[PDB]
Amino acid sequence: VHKMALLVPFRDRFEELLQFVPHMTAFLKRQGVAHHIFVLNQVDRFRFNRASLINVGFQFASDVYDYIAMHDVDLLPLNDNLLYEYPSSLGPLHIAGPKLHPKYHYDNFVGGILLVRREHFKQMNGMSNQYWGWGLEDDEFFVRIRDAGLQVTRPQNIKTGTNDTFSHIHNRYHRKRDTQKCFNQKEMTRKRDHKTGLDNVKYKILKVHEMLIDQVPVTILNILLDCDVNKTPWCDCS
Ligand SMILES: O=c1ccn([C@@H]2O[C@H](COP(=O)(O)OP(=O)(O)O)[C@@H](O)[C@H]2O)c(=O)[nH]1
Ligand SMILES: O[C@@H]1[C@@H](O)[C@H](O[C@@H]2CO[C@@H](O)[C@H](O)[C@H]2O)OC[C@H]1O
Ligand SMILES: [Mn+2]
Structure with missing residues (x-):
């Protein structure tokens, strides 16, 4: 049988993580999905880089x-018909589709929760590394999906919709999205990145922690990501 690596980019979300782990373990257990949670704890001081953390976890x-699930720690599925299954030969299986996601509704939204076969993630050279702070890393990945001749599939015949498919417990003031721009960030991050990916993400895993949360085993990666300020100075706008 298949096994899912549940990759959870993480910094300063302990409260969310305590809710995430039990919810997901139970949910996945009901549909027979074998898996393991990898908390991708970014311990450097640069701005949050979700995509790079995913590369590392992979x-x-x-x-x-x-296969892997790139999974936000604050997004819980409420519908057991969302199948976290091995994706088909077509490409990634997008669990949190535009018609089910509480907040994001455009056609090619592939954020929140995205499942990708090992082989396809290797094909696409994983995710871009240039996304420091909120936004755009998932959209650039969409393009990587089309450029690899792949496509996105989503669950069919889900009866629930944008108000009752997911719990997205994320208060915009408690957990601020880091939307700052500095250096030439706008210009540069809006363009397709053919130069970085899985194969050159620069980092060190300082420490690996085996944690149990109410018996459920979970792996913590303390990931010190590196920033080349000659290429991505917007990793830090202070
Ligand atoms: O400072 C941060 C920023 C984000 N994240 C992780 O990145 C995910 C995606 O971030 P965010 O919630 O801001 O995305 P959005 O709600 O806009 O889809 C979060 O749910 C967390 O798993 C985190 O751990 N610390
Ligand atoms: O990373 C993603 C953002 O880049 C995204 O922002 C949207 C992109 O398409 C535009 O038409 C919209 O103005 C904008 O909402 O939102 C989702 C996020 O995960
Ligand atoms: Mn969120």
């Missing part, structure tokens, strides 16, 4: 996981 995870 490298770390062993070949026994034949």
